[PDB]
Amino acid sequence: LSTTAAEVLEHVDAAVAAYPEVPIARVRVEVAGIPRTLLLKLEGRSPWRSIKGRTALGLVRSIAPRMASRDVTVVESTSGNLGVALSAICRDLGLPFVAVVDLKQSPVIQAAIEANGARLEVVRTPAAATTHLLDRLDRVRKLVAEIPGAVWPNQYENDANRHVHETWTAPEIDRQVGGEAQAVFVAVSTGGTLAGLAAHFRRARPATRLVAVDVEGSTVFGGVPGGRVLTGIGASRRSTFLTRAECDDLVYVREAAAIAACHVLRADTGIAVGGSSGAVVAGALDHLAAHPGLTTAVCVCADLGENYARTVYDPDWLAPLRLTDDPGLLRSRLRGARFHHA
Numbered sequence: 001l002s003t004t005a006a007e008v009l010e011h012v013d014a015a016v017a018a019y020p021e022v023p024i025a026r027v028r029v030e031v032a033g034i035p036r037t038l039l040l041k042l043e044g045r046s047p048w049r050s051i052k053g054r055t056a057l058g059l060v061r062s063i064a065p066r067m068a069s070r071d072v073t074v075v076e077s078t079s080g081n082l083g084v085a086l087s088a089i090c091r092d093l094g095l096p097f098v099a100v101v102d103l104k105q106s107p108v109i110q111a112a113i114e115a116n117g118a119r120l121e122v123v124r125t126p127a128a129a130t131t132h133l134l135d136r137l138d139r140v141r142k143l144v145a146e147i148p149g150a151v152w153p154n155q156y157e158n159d160a161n162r163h164v165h166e167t168w169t170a171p172e173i174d175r176q177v178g179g180e181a182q183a184v185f186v187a188v189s190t191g192g193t194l195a196g197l198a199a200h201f202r203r204a205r206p207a208t209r210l211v212a213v214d215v216e217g218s219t220v221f222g223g224v225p226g227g228r229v230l231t232g233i234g235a236s237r238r239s240t241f242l243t244r245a246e247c248d249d250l251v252y253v254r255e256a257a258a259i260a261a262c263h264v265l266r267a268d269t270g271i272a273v274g275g276s277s278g279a280v281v282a283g284a285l286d287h288l289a290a291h292p293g294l295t296t297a298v299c300v301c302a303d304l305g306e307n308y309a310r311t312v313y314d315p316d317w318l319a320p321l322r323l324t325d326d327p328g329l330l331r332s333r334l335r336g337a338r339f340h341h342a
């Protein structure tokens, strides 16, 4: 171990011992005449305000031994959340960090990345092309060549991503509500979270249904990429970590139901979840309607609504999509679903 590498490892292990337990909010909603409990795993209640704080620590740990000195620049592609966490860890460690982003990124998340002193490399792909991710990966490789010291953790293929969720995220959930949860709903982009959770649950709770939630136009599990307004959830490439056989079901959600879920849940309970979380809640509403015997499920909520305050919760961003922020109208997009505290 070099000097820089020993320290990084130690910082990462301190962050992990000091990482809080992520809470669960218990919510009830009647679906097709049958009451259901949603266990919302609120991963935005966390130091870097998303689940990707765990991902980021997993990844930094894996790239530490590659660090000779403090010359190293950390480069990574992100839709947002991983940026914030890697950005913060690198600020805390004194290591420079370049975040490769595109124009679709949530402004709130982009601002939290800049505030951590990262360098933003914006990619100029026009919003409503389908090559954003490939263009980001493209630009990352240009930067790894053009910058000495440069180190790419590769969230997309680095097994540390799935591994952290298998060994940390999934046991915590299991320990909290494993005896109760008949299903777990998980949004996909890289697929590392679900691949990790699935690896844990298929061993420890085989009877628990694992359900991927994705959005229209995402090709995590195959298909033809299409344009999307939501971020975090969805990718224009197949997952390295996960195939369709590794989970029990897969539901795609229209983005307007995801948006509707965000607003209605907030109105009904005061829990404001992030965009992918709304898609997960919408997806669980659909899935439970088709499964009368499923009455308790975890929704893994990747982040919270404060990250989307100038998109998903902004009346002006919604107007070009023909949507209000009126909970009553948006409830019609969820078949009248009503949430309450359990």
Ligand SMILES: *[C@H](NC(=C)C(=O)O)c1c(COP(=O)(O)O)cnc(C)c1O
Binding pocket: 050, 052, 077, 078, 079, 080, 081, 082, 083, 187, 188, 189, 190, 191, 192, 193, 194, 231, 232, 233, 274, 275, 276, 277, 302, 303
């Ligand atoms: C993670 N997405 C990112 C690509 C990132 O750069 O942070 C993500 C996900 C999907 O999680 P995976 O483990 O499948 O990548 C879902 N929801 C949000 C908000 C998010 O940041």
